[PDB]
Amino acid sequence: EYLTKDSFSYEVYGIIAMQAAYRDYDSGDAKQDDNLGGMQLNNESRIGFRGKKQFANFEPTFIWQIEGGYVDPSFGGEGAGLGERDTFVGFESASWGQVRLGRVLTPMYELVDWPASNPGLGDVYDWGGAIGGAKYQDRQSNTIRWDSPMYADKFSIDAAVGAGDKAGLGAGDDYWGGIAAHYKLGPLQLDAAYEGNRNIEAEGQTWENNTYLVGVQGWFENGISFFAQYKYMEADASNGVNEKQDAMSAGLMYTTGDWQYKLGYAANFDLERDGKTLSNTSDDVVSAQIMYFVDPSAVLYARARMNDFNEGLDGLDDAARWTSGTNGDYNEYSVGVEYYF
Amino acid sequence: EYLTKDSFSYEVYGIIAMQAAYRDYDSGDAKQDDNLGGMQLNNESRIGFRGKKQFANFEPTFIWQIEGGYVDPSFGGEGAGLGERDTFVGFESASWGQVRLGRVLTPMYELVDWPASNPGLGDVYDWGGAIGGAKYQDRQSNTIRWDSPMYADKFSIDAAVGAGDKAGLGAGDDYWGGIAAHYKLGPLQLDAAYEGNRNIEAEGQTWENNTYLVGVQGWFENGISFFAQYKYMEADASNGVNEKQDAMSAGLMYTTGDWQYKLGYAANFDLERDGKTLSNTSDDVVSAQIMYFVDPSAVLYARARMNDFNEGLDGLDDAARWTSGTNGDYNEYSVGVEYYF
Amino acid sequence: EYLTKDSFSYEVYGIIAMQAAYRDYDSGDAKQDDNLGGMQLNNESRIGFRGKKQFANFEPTFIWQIEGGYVDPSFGGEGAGLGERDTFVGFESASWGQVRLGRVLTPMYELVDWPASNPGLGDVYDWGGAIGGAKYQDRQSNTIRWDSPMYADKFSIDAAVGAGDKAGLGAGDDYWGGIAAHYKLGPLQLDAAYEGNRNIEAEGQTWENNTYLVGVQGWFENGISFFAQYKYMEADASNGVNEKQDAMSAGLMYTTGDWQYKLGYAANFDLERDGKTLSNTSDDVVSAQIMYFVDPSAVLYARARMNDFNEGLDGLDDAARWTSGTNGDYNEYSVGVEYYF
């Protein structure tokens, strides 16, 4: 009558995550600075569910997972639903790897975010950017996504296509596709990825976007580790207009006993529209962090960082293009905790 | 202190369900056709919770359940909450069956939807219809519902009443009740059901609605199976106006080893307002489907279907009445998967 | 190979709760009376998750929990998310007690609500009130909160500070802090609590608020129990204006075998603005209830009550201040059930 792991058809998994996070804004509205600014909590804890199933008439193993969103972020109300995060189904054989339908990370985004949005670099390197149309999607519903196996312990591919933000609501024909690749090499790992976005409606124009990324990551027998990337973003409006913007992000780490120190930098460079540059569309961030390996399963950290954002641009409709900078330059000290089970 | 089934006071249950689904619209706006049209995923996976409890001072066994909504449907955003689907409490004795309070299916709806909205027929036979007021509720909050036992292996009753869509928000005095019945007979099963809806506010008129259904269902020793129904809908405005509309839905099936083939048809007939018919308020759908019994616990399927919808009508306020047809005629090929645990 | 309690890193806990609840409104719009009025179900069931963790490098035990909102209340739509209720992380040592970051009850609110909003008294004693600004927060995101241990079996402190309703969305600089205290004494328990609220934006003024509470609670060897409180609320606008309002709430109980009878009363008194009283800003409620201890884990109850609310006031902008009375005087009979696991 007792239970085993085999009694259940699902696993609960969770990621408990809290960050007390103080911000000092410097947008040059003294008022706006206090709203945005100050301390908040940022609970990005969440729960999920997943399981396998060996169907009796299909050798590829069935897989499914349903992850809840963040329960009470900062700048946010409480509560969140099941499947705001990685929710999907799929299959897996050892020979061809796996494929997932639904709501996953794009293969481009998985690198933009990790390792290269950590820590605090997201504002600039993730959704920061001044480019038109859509540089890439991130987590996206309506996606199919192949993850190849590790070919001869070195080479891996992340391939995916899916529907757009609008089209998954039947309010557009926006689509996209993307591919990434990863080459393990001694202590290195080479990352390259791509993602084209088509029929994007924005500023009263249709946009095709293309984004390319190269980067590298190292882990060394002595405790030094690092990551670095260059991202390039093109885009083209249906009225002829071209835009270009490139960025980067870099991270240096020292690890020692139960500790890890981390400096990160990232930046988008001035933006080009039709050969002419747009002065002060630069963004950058510097960041620093101490982290403590408080349990095999958890970490504490303390963190400071500084965003200096762009001084703004119009989109193609003669009206301000929203950027991770429209709220304004801010800095931010935070302590936090994270627990995996 | 190992665990058993008896260690827990709840059960997690899930229904994992994914459907890649391509649509070709033919509304005669070329633009509108692309938005709506195209492929989308349709994750209707969800999770729930439920348990019994034998209260020491009450012989009837306590029952409760909380089912999450669909996590990332088509034409929809991601995420969903606990108790968007069948959420309730109740009790049960073998002599009188069970009763449930909260959010359940109406006894009418349980038949409209099953078997007779499957497969793809829902657009027409479920929420499709041109009639005024409210034909029936479906899943409804604020409901009490009795499910009688199987009297002498043949006769069963589904009985229920509850509050309206408005009244459960304290913005109305809408109410309703409904009853169904089921008679098992050799290889057949006779279904009849009813549902009256009162004080419904709509088109600046209060409406009383009455809807009646008869149908049948057969399973044969040789692998043929089928279902058929006629649904009749009356409604009456508080300004005198009458409306009538009838429908039907039929399903033929062949099953064989691990396979099941399925043709379905359904249709609402032109609508009558005060004796005069409204030409082209007809809707129909034809649908076909192969399904494969991929595990005791799961099925794969492939499916095609064609909706031809009504060409539109006004409500009693001289302004378009919304119908499952306002977006327009479309067809749709889909593959999907479904897993129960 | 089997599982134990120690196999999991989380616990599922739930509170299943249903209340059929009929209301007869008497606002003197005959229409309004029916909308609001009538029966509804009130499912306040919900689910949560929580767990401890003994980090290898930190003696204080890690604690976390994530509680879902109410699944289908009355006057409400269905569904709710994970972490609409008490969601947090924290730590605990026996010497200093515990601390929690996130979304918790304020230390003031925990007493306002319990024991002194039960049963039905909430309308008047919880969010009822006519005072300006914000008397107190209740459940609040972005809060840190210390719960001291029980010092020498008598003395306990609940201390907390957090951000405002706006500021947790970066749309304000509202903050607050609060402290309660509890002295066990023979069969009594003395409660006192406090909560100041700062920079509250409302009626085109900034408000500082201060709210003070004293109360008492008794349990007697013979089956009688009771509670009582007096709550005092000051507030001060940034345009000079002062307001004052005091309230109370009292509860008498007899318990016997498996039964408990309960009379409750509560009331807010007329409100003072700048020394002058606002006639008929009084609110009160009387309530009665029988409850049956149907299982170690659950209760049934039946309940009647009567709210007589204020006849209305303006805020400082010459426009109606919302109160738990704007909808109007109502009474209400209800039966319900509650199950803990």
Author numbering:
A (entry chain A), B (entry chain B), C (entry chain C): 10 to 350
What does the primary publication say about this deposited structure?
The gene encoding for ChiP is found in most marine members of the Vibrionaceae, emphasizing the general importance of this OM diffusion channel for chitin utilization. The addition of micromolar concentrations of chitooligosaccharides such as chitohexaose (GlcNAc6) causes a complete block of ionic current, demonstrating tight binding. Here, we report X-ray crystal structures of VhChiP in the absence and presence of chitooligosaccharides.
Subsequently we cloned VhChiP without a signal sequence and with a C-terminal His6-tag into pET28a to express the protein into inclusion bodies (IBs) and avoid toxicity issues. In vitro-folded VhChiP forms a trimeric assembly of oval β-barrels, each consisting of 16 strands, like the general diffusion porins OmpF/C from E. coli. Instead, the first N-terminal 17 amino acids of VhChiP are not part of the barrel and extend into the periplasm where they form a trimerization motif like that observed in the phosphate transporter OprP from Pseudomonas aeruginosa. The first nine amino acids of the N-terminus are disordered and not visible in the electron density.
